[PDB]
Ligand binder design. Sequence first.
Ligand code: LMY
Length: 466
Amino acid sequence: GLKAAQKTLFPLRSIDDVVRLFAAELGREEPDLVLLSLVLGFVEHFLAVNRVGLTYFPVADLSIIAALYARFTAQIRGAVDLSLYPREGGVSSRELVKKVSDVIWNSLSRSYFKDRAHIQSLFSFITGTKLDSSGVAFAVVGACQALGLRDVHLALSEDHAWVVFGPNGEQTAEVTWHGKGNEDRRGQTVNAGVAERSWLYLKGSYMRCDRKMEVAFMVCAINPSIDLHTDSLELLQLQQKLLWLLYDLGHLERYPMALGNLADLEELEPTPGRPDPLTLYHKGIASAKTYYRDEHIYPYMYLAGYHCRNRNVREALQAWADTATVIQDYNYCREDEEIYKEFFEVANDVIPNLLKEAASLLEAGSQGSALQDPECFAHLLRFYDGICKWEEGSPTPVLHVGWATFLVQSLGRFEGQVRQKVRIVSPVLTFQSEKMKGMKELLVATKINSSAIKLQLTAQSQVQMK
Ligand SMILES: CNc1nc(NC2CCN(Cc3ccc4c(cc(C#N)n4C[C@]45C[C@](NC=O)(C4)C5)c3C)CC2)c2cc(CC(F)(F)F)sc2n1
């Protein structure tokens, strides 16, 4: 509106007052995305971007928030003439979605760093004319809500955002850019990306938000970071309390990564009487299995990262094996580089460092070490197997020799007597990838044949002539 009922809690003087506003909006037929994003962006600005003069909490006065809200609605309503886009059947047209996208896009500053922190909210859009990639998609949805377009909703993969709209909510439209140096596809469907089985479009198992999930998205989008070394405790608390509010209302049920975010916040500062982080990570994985065909990678990464921080090598390896079992059924496509980077860093930095410490602890007499557990060797092998299977049939390759030395080193952290205990069948493990099937006979030698492993992992045809 803003409607009278939306104004009664102002001024917001504390974290808890912001939570009360979110609770009130989430109890309405349609929570007001523009109001909520402006409030979060205002408090984030004064808690993380500029803390000069902060004494407790940046009071959000109604006059200030209402003026920002009016700037947004005036910009959208003045620029989008709905009479040019008649709404057949109470649903929106592709041309109307494209117009809203164009209005947001054309408002942005001509040159700025797109990966900056704190450019996600409508506060940033209004005051700085800057948005990050997914911020543009959220702003399009908020503008559509402000215009009365109840069918336009945010769609989210694990690395991109777009909109759904139209009859039955069945149309898709790109509304923002993805990554750096890719060609704009605004206004097009996501069908080519779904059909090519890229990770970017999740084989179609992406999130189709309702309004409550769009509120969850903006809460996950809070960025508490003040600088590289410092987070705002106030914004961490706000994000944590808002995620618990959403959790209790059922609005995280279909949002795996939000459950992982909540688990990470609980690990940092547990809330008495709430579930443990592990329970929450497992709920995020359950959500992905239940609603998204177990086609998401990050729920397992969140779990693996917790185990890795807790130096629980066995369960970290299991969770990484599970990430690879998801990725194996994708084709590695152009624009999937973010997930390639995660696997590369896990394989070639994180696992090596974890196993190096495990080896030192084993030398010092550790008992029950992952390095003496053949099931942990099997998890390592299953991790590589899924990456090799991912590569099969893909338009771009995954493995190269820069992976091969780390594989040889990690395999060799397990003594041959441990490695011998895994039965590879066509502790028991079955390989899905042809690369790992051919590597089987190299996996039990006391001194692994490093050159042969490298040949098998990279499918290198030849050794040096001379
Ligand atoms: C909360 N809601 C939420 N979150 C989203 N993305 C989150 C994805 C996970 N990251 C953290 C992160 C990043 C890498 C990690 C782990 C855990 C592990 C593990 N193991 N790794 C791999 C590592 C270990 C490494 N190296 C040294 O340690 C990092 C390699 C973790 C938790 C934070 C953002 C998105 C994206 C959307 C699409 C958009 F809208 F944006 F278009 S919607 C949306 N919603």
